[PDB]
Paper text:
Heterologous antigens can be inserted into the major immunodominant region (MIR), which is located at the tip of surface α-helical spikes, or the C-terminus, whilst retaining the ability to assemble into a stable particle. FHbp is a lipoprotein that binds serum factor H, as an immune evasion mechanism, through a protein surface which mimics carbohydrate ligands.
Consequently, HBcS-NadA-CFHbp was subjected to higher resolution structure determination by cryoelectron microscopy. Processing of single particle data showed that the T = 4 form of the capsid predominated. Interestingly, the spike conformation appears stabilized by the base stacking of Trp71 and Tyr88, which could play a role in stabilising the NadA insertion. Electron density for the CFHbp domain appears to be absent. This may be due to steric clashes which could de-stabilize the folded state of the antigen domain: limited space on the interior of the capsid would constrain packing of adjacent CFHbp domain monomers.
Author numbering:
A (entry chain A), D (entry chain C), E (entry chain A): 1 to 76, 385 to 445
B (entry chain B), C (entry chain D), F (entry chain B): 1 to 76, 385 to 446
The structure:
Amino acid sequence: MDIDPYKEFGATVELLSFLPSDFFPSVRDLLDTASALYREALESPEHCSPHHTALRQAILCWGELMTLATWVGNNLRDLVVNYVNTNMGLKIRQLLWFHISCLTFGRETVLEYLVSFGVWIRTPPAYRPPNAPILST
Amino acid sequence: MDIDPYKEFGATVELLSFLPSDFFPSVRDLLDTASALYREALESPEHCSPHHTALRQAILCWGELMTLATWVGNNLRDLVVNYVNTNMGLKIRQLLWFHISCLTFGRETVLEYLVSFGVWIRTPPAYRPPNAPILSTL
Amino acid sequence: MDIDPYKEFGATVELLSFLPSDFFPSVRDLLDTASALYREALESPEHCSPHHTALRQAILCWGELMTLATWVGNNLRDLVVNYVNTNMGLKIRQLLWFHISCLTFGRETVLEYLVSFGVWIRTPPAYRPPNAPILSTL
Amino acid sequence: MDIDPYKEFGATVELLSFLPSDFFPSVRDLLDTASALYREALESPEHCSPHHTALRQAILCWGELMTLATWVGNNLRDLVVNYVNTNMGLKIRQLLWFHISCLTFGRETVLEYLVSFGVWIRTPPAYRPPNAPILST
Amino acid sequence: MDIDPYKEFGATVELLSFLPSDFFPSVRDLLDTASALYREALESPEHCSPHHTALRQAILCWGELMTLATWVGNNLRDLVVNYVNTNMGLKIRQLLWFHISCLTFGRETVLEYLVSFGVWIRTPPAYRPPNAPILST
Amino acid sequence: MDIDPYKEFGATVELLSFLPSDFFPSVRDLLDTASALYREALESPEHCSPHHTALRQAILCWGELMTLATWVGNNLRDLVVNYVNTNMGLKIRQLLWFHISCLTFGRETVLEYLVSFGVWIRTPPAYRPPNAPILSTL
């Protein structure tokens, strides 16, 4: 079956395909952003939103992938570090970026950001404004 | 930080720890159970439960884990598959079994069951009833 | 003076002497069980029960012995640990079995269980029914 | 699992470390004091307080600590006797002093005294009441 | 004990860890900004906000640190000037920047600025807009 | 500019000047007094007083000052410690004592006390009562 990670949140994997690969900050930057803002909330047992629930799972799913990559790098191997942190870690960098942005800025603002980034990224460089659109408030 | 994936649901990882390894069916058998009788719920964009939101992530995580075992397979190598499906896949099977059971039976059926299994399995086998507590709809 | 710790709970150490000594599961199995579903209430300052109040003191007493048991194994040696975790810890496992089950299953039900299990033990084994009485929530 | 045994009684382990350590009368004196005038209440099958329940564990814990320290002194062996009266003794000696005082004077009288006494010894002697405060009924 | 300087003001030391070290203007720039805007208010004995109270203390705490660094540089030593004005003075540059910003722009705007800066600072440089977000009104 | 840290509180630095050096306990003894019986207030994010806001800054300032004395210690050197804890630490001890006293006793108890100590200590010892005015709850 084809479980769309985003479809319940009003987005889709085609919609985050507007964002480039090297747009997402690294996993360490996301987790610090999650820890500085929602450390009491993610470890809270209260349901405030399903954004928290998809964030708790994705943090632990990254905790598995570093553990397996540690297991490979100690038993089998430097290419594996290059593979996981780039080609597999991008999908974690999508899910971490999405729910941290939705909890901070609202679901509605994020979905309008993906369209507004889409205009920017489709625009030819000669007519593209110099700064990328960035989320705030 | 330390995040308990069950703490939302009135359960803890210690409560799920008393279940043995073989209590869980194989990882394919959970996903087939998910895909057969919750597929119209999972692929729907409706938040029908916090379980459904939580459950979708587990498929996507396991499909991510099997991507690497496939990758390490034809790049380097089969001992890795013995490590994932056995040692690390149990955490997926805990995760998959728990939501599917809470979706099929309710939380209250499962959360009473994990206690009643806990008092069962902690008892030594000389004093233990020979039949394990099964999970029923009551 | 000799204080019976179970006396104020409708029990006595006679009634817990019905149980065989190996029936009580290991200390880690009890401590994880109180950490499973009572970790909130134990660290809570709310007087919820005397069973809480007793159980807080029993954990801290248990952690105090292991602090001294590792001290002798650091400064004098594991026969000491073999002495504690068999003989003095057996009295500790009696409390941790007691108050956990009285909170989880009701104090009245536990007191009936001690009587009902004693019937099962004092029955000669050839006429003993194969299932043991065990606590659950049916 | 971090349990502060005084937290339900409106104190902390820190607030009882706030007193000087030699302030606390000896463990033998505390065991005789509860046996003097609470012995019928401790042997009673009816708690009149959670203090009674908490205090009954404290003898039975200290029965275990003296048993083990005896057992080491039977077969090995006197470092342990001084050690258990250095760290393990003081924890019980705070604990036995607290509930015996709470059953005698009430909680609020004790808890105000703990604040009052530790300020008194942490006051320079020329600018304080001359004699130490002591508990009043 | 771990006294968080910011926790009562809705922020935390993890939240100002989003801001870089060389983002904060020097102590002389903050004190002139405090003197040009709040000289009558800081020396006023009226409580308008606890932001004033934490600002009066932090100004005097900097007045101590320059006095001690003057004392070292005249009695013991050029490395000390490099140490205090960088590694110790940063924490004063945090507290001075925070309360001057909160008194001028509102507490709510400052806390939304730290999140909005966090997006900017986590963003990869190729997709980062050229100007940093800056407070106004 | 010149900022009086006490002017908010109905006191001045001149009013706190009449207190001698030895009237204040040692700096550890103030912080231990703060940490023992106001720790749940200070570490809470609630503005319960302007004193609590003011008091938190003093710990953080003293921890900043002791960072340097530790730094000058293992870099260069012990005469500096004699300068901080004695000459400059008194300004911390004035600051720490004042809020802790105003929290424990009220402002009005302290502000009457600093006057009654002022008329006491300004009087020469031949005419002075031999007992210092102590600070009491009245």
